[PDB]
Amino acid sequence: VRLDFSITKDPAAEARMKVACITEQVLTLVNKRIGLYRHFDETVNRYKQSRDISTLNSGKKSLETEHKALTSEIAL
Amino acid sequence: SVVSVISRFLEEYLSSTPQRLKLLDAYLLYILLTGALQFGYCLLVGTFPFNSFLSGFISCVGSFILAVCLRIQINPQNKADFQGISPERAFADFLFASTILHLVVMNFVG
Amino acid sequence: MITDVQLAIFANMLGVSLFLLVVLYHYVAVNNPKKQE
Amino acid sequence: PSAMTVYALVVVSYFLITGGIIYDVIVEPPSVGSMTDEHGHQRPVAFLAYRVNGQYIMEGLASSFLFTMGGLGFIILDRSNAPNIPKLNRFLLLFIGFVCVLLSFFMARVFMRMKLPGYLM
Amino acid sequence: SYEKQDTLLKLLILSMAAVLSFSTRLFAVLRFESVIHEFDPYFNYRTTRFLAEEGFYKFHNWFDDRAWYPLGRIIGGTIYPGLMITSAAIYHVLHFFHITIDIRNVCVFLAPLFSSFTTIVTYHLTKELKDAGAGLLAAAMIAVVPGYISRSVAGSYDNEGIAIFCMLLTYYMWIKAVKTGSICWAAKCALAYFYMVSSWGGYVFLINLIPLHVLVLMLTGRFSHRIYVAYCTVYCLGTILSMQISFVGFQPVLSSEHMAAFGVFGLCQIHAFVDYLRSKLNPQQFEVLFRSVISLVGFVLLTVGALLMLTGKISPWTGRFYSLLDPSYAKNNIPIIASVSEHQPTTWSSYYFDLQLLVFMFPVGLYYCFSNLSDARIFIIMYGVTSMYFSAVMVRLMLVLAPVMCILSGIGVSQVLSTYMKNLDISRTYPIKNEVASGMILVMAFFLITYTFHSTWVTSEAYSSPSIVLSARGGDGSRIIFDDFREAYYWLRHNTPEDAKVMSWWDYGYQITAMANRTILVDNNTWNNTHISRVGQAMASTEEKAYEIMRELDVSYVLVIFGGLTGYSSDDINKFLWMVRIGGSTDTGKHIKENDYYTPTGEFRVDREGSPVLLNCLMYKMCYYRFGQVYTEAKRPPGFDRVRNAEIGNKDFELDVLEEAYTTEHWLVRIYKVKDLDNRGLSRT
C-alpha cells in the first residue's frame, strides 16, 4: 500500500483527497467545539452546585480562547 | 482518374501529419514489406516446416498490430476516447505486449 | 466428527444470514447521499 | 429492429427452449402418458414420474409458461412504477404483476412436488 | 465514517460467501472418505502424482505403455495439463513450508478452493457490469448454485472445476479491455485465455463468442477504437499462445472452429481502414474508390472463403462440436458418444432442479441489459442467449449456463431491490406506496431464502453420492456398504503376475489402471474405436470364436461386473446391447448382428424364452456361471436375477476356456482366467 506505480499525477484527485482530509480535521474540531460546549454546560452544572462564579468565568474564558482558536483554524 | 485521387490523398497526408506519426507509417511499411515477402516465399517453396513459417508470420502480424495500436493510443485526436491513458502508459503497454509476443514466437520458431 | 446434518444446518443458516445481509446492504446503499450526488 | 423487438424475440425463444422442445424433437415423447386403472382401463398421466431426466411434450410447455409469467411479472411491476399512469391503473399493475409473481412460483413449486414425491421431504 | 461501514459490509458479505462456497461442497467427505470419486478423476490423479514425482520435462515427454496395450498412449501429447500443473504447484508450495500434505488431499480439495475464488471473480465481473450491490447478489447466488456444485463437490477432481474459474477470469479481463481500451488489459486477457486453453477443451466457446460480440458491436455501429485495440491484441496473443499446447497444435489456424475469429479480424481491418479513407477524402472522390475497392476485396474474400473449404485444406467440424450444432449426428454416426447418457438433451425438470429462482429472474436481467444497452452489456446478452441454447442441446453444458444465469439473476434482483428500497427512503397513496414496497421487499427476501433451502437440499440428497462404493440401508436403517469393486481390484493388485493383461469394457479402464496397476486393452478415452470394437466382438461372439481374439491380444484375465445378485442396475448385461452394436460396427464384425439376439417377437430377455445365441455368448456364460443354483430370494426360485426379474434359461453348463479365478462376496465383480492352450493338441469341444 505504501508503494505507488504512478507516472502522471491528477491534481484534481489530490485536491479531492486533501479536501477530504481537511474536512475530517474540521469535523473533529467541530466535534471538539460541541465537546467544549459540553464542558461548559458541565461547568454550569458545577456552578449551580457550587455557586462559585470563578469556575464559570474561567470556563467562559477558556471557551472564548480554545473555541476561538478552533474557529480561527477552521477559517484558515 | 485514380492517379489524381491518389495525388489529392498524398498532398494532404504529407502536410497534415506530425513527424512522430510519419515515423510509425514508415515502420509499418517495413513490417508489411517483410510479412508480404515471407508469405510470397511460403507459397513459392512450400509449407514445411509449418512451425517456423507460422511463427515468423504471426510475429510480423503481431508487431504490425501493436504498432497500429501505438499509432492510435498516442494520436491526440482520440484523447476523448482513450481517457485516462497517457502516451507513456501506451508505450509501456506496447513494450509489455511486444515482450510477450517475442517470448512466445521464440517458443514457436522451433 | 461433524455429521452431514450439522453441516446442512450450518449451511442453511449461512445462506439465510447472507441473503438477509445483502438485503441490508441495498438499504445502506440507497440511503447514501454520496451515491446520488 | 429496436431493442424491445429483439428482447421480445428472445423471450419467445426462452419459452420454447426452456420447455425442452429440443428434447421433444429428438426423443419425441407423447404429450401425456396413460396408466392402468384397477378396473383395467387407462387413465392418462401428465407427468413422467420419478424420471427427473424425462418429460412429456405438454409438461414442458406448462412449466415454461409458469416461468414466463414469473419473468414478466416483475416487468409489469417496474412498468407500474411510472408517475404518469393514472393511479387507478397503477394499483392494478401492482395487482397483476404481483399475483403473477406469486401464483406462477407457487404453482411451479407444486408441479415439481408432483414430479418428485420426496422433493424437499 | 460511511466509507468504513460500506467497506466493512462488503468485506463481511464476501467472506461469508467464500466460506459458504467452500463449506457446502464437503458433504461427500463427511459422509464417506477423503477419496477420489467417479471413473475419470482417477486418470487425472495418476497423471498428477506422476507430474508431482517425475518433474515437468518427464511428464511432457511421457509415454505410457501400461494402457492401450499393445499400442500405448502418448500422454503429454493428448492431455490438457493445466489442472495437473496447478495441483503440482500447490503441492510444491505447501511442501516448501514443510506442510507435507498428501497429494491426494490436494487433489480432493482443489475444487472447493477454486470454487471459492470464482465467487470473488464473479463479484468483480458483476460489479463492472452494474454496481457492487449486484455483485454481492451474484456472489451469494453462485456460491450455492446447485448446477455448478454438481460438478465441483470435493473429490470431483475433473477439469470442470478449474475451467469455470479460467472462463470467468477471461470474461472479466475481456470486459475490462472493451470498457477501457488498453493494451495492458488485452495482454492480460490473452494470458487468461492461454491459461484457460491449457486447462479445458471448452476454450473454443470463448474463441467463438468474443468474435460474435465484436460483430454485433459492428452491426449496431458501436464499434470504436477501443474494440479494435482489444480485439486485435487479444486475437494475436491468444492465437500464438494457444497454439503452444501440443494437444491443440495447429488447430487454431487449420480448423473451421476458429475461422470465425479470423474472419472478424479481417473485417475489423477492412472497417478500420474504410473509416480512415472516408475521413480523408471528399465524397465525390471517395465513392468511386469505395465501390471499386469493395468490389475487389470483397470478391477476394468471397473466393478465398470458398476455396478454403472446397479444397478440404481447412479441416471440417469435429464430430463432437458438430454434434453440438446438430443434435442428431452422434446418435447415427458414433454410438460411443450416444452411449453416454450425459449427452441427452435437457428437460425442464433439470432446469428447475438445478436453478429454481434463477429460471424466473434471468428474463429480468435480460430486460435490464436490453433497457440500458452498452458495449460491455452486449457481451453478457450474447453469453446468456448462447448458453440458454447450448444448455438445451446437452445437459453436460449446464455448467456453462449456471454462471451467466447467476450474474443476470443478481442484476435483476439488484434492480428490483434498489428500485423499491428508494421508496422506503422515508428516513430523510404514499402510505400505500410504502406498504407495497415493504411487501415486495418481503416477497424478495422470501424467494431468496427458499433458494437457499432448495440448493442445500439438492446438494445434500442428489449430487453427493459416490460411485466407487455402493450403499444401502438395512431394515434398521444402518448403512449397508458394498466394497466389492475395491476388493476385486486389490485381489488383482496382489495375487496376479505383474505383467498380466486384464480385458474389460472401457468404462473400468481407469479404475483397473489406477487401483489394480495392471495392463488393460481399452480405456475411457476412445481414441481407437477399432480396438473397442475388437473387444466388443470378443465379448459378443461365441465362446469358441472369442478365444481366438483373446489369444490374439495375449489376454491373461477378463473381468465382468454382475449385479443380478444385488440389483445393481448398471451391470454389463445392460451394456450388452451397446457391446454388440460396437462389435458389429467394424467391417470385421459383420457376422455380429443385433437382430440375432432379440427373440422373434423383438425383445431382449435372458429367461427360457431368450435367443439361443444370447444364452450362448461369452458374456452371458461369464455372468451366470453357477448363478443358476443361487437362492436369490425367499419367494423366488433359484436362479432369480434381481435386475431382469427373470429366472435364467440356461442354468447348467461348463466353461471350457476360462476358469473362475475370483468371485467377490456379493458376486458384484467376477474375474476369470483364460485357460492356457491345451497341452495335448486336443480340441476343446
Name the residue ranges covered by the structural domains of chain B: 7-109
3-state secondary structure of E173: helix
Neighbouring subunits of D (3+ Cβ pairs under 8 A): E
Neighbouring subunits of C (3+ Cβ pairs under 8 A): E
- Which chain B residues are Cβ-neighbours of A13 within 8 angstroms? none
Nearby residues of D117 by Cβ (< 8 Å), 6 or more positions away:
D49, D50
Residue E461 to residue E459: CA distance in whole angstroms: 6
Q: What angle do CA E394, E395, E399 make, to 5 degrees?
A: 110
CB E168 within 8 A of CB E445: no
- E646 phi, psi to nearest 5 deg: -140, 140
How many Cβ atoms are within 10 Å of E237's Cβ, its own excluded? 27
User: Resolution in angstroms, to 1 decimal, for this deposition?
Assistant: 7.6
Residue E365 to residue B44: CA distance in whole angstroms: 55
For C18, the closest of E16, E133, E460 (CB atoms) is E16
Binding residue positions of E for dolichyl diphosphooligosaccharide: 396, 510
3-state secondary structure of E560: strand
Q: How far is E404 from chain B (nearest CA, A)?
A: 29
Minimal CA–CA distance to E214: which of E152, E165, E263, E149? E263
Residue B25 to residue E233: CA distance in whole angstroms: 19
Return residues 393-452 of E near D (CB < 8 Å).
Answer: 393, 395, 412, 415-416, 419, 429, 432, 436, 439-440, 443, 447
3-state secondary structure of C26: helix
Segment (H or E) for E558: strand E557-561
Decide if B97 and E250 are in contact by the 8 Å CB cutoff: no
Kindly give the interhelix angle for E82-96 and E41-54, rounded to the nearest 10 degrees.
50
Return residues 440-479 of E near C (CB < 8 Å).
Answer: 441, 444-445, 448-449, 451-453, 455-456, 459-460, 464
Residue E470 to residue E570: CA distance in whole angstroms: 12
Residue C19 to residue C14: CA distance in whole angstroms: 9
CB D84 within 8 A of CB E339: no
DSSP assignment of B51-102 equals HHHHHHHHHHHHHHHHHHHHHHHS-GGGTTTSTT--HHHHHHHHHHHHHHHH
For D105, the closest of E360, E395, E439 (CB atoms) is E360
- Which chain E residues are Cβ-neighbours of C25 within 8 angstroms? 9-10, 13, 133, 136
Segment (H or E) for E502: strand E501-503
Decide if B96 and E232 are in contact by the 8 Å CB cutoff: no
Q: Convert E432-496 into a string of H (helix), E (strand) and C (coil).
A: HHHHHHHHHHHHHHHHHHHHHHHHHHHHHHCCCCCCCCEEEECCCCCEEEECHHHHHHHHHHHHC
CB E533 within 8 A of CB E580: no
3-state secondary structure of E315: strand
- Which chain B residues are Cβ-neighbours of A7 within 8 angstroms? 86, 88-89
Q: What angle do CA E229, E231, E233 make, to 5 degrees?
A: 65
Residue B76 to residue E83: CA distance in whole angstroms: 45
Task: Report the residue of E414, E421, E443, E451 to disrupt the C interface, i.e. the one with the largest count of C CBs within 10 Å.
Answer: E421
Question: Could you give the C-alpha distances from E14 to E120, E140, E168, E456, in angstroms and in order?
Answer: 7, 8, 17, 19
Question: Could you give the C-alpha distances from C8 to D94, E28, E148, E647, in angstroms and in order?
Answer: 37, 12, 18, 44
Decide if E345 and D23 are in contact by the 8 Å CB cutoff: yes
- E345 phi, psi to nearest 5 deg: -70, 160
Segment (H or E) for D70: helix D57-80
Please identify which residue in the block is written with the cell numbers 511486444.
B98
Nearby residues of E613 by Cβ (< 8 Å), 6 or more positions away:
E542, E596, E597
Minimal CA–CA distance to E210: which of E182, E187, E243, E177? E177
Nearby residues of D12 by Cβ (< 8 Å), 6 or more positions away:
none
Q: Tell me which method was used to determine the 3D structure.
A: cryo-EM
Please identify which residue in the block is written with the cell numbers 466428527.
C1
For E20, the closest of C3, C11, C25 (CB atoms) is C11
Decide if E425 and C30 are in contact by the 8 Å CB cutoff: yes
Contact E/D (≥3 CB pairs under 8 Å): yes
Residue of A nearest to B85 (CA): A8
Pairing of the two strands D42-45 and D33-36: antiparallel
E403: cell is 454462471
Q: Is C14 on the interface with E (CB under 8 A)?
A: yes
* Cis preceding linkage at E70, omega within 30: yes
E strand residue ranges, chain D: 33-36, 42-45
3-state secondary structure of E111: helix
Residue of E nearest to D66 (CA): E360
Amino acid at E634: A
Task: Report the residue of E216, E349, E364, E441 to disrupt the D interface, i.e. the one with the largest count of D CBs within 10 Å.
Answer: E349
Residue C16 to residue B88: CA distance in whole angstroms: 50
Q: Is D29 left (phi over 0), alpha (psi -120 to 50) or beta?
A: beta
Question: Could you give the C-alpha distances from E101 to E5, E49, E117, in angstroms and in order?
Answer: 39, 13, 21
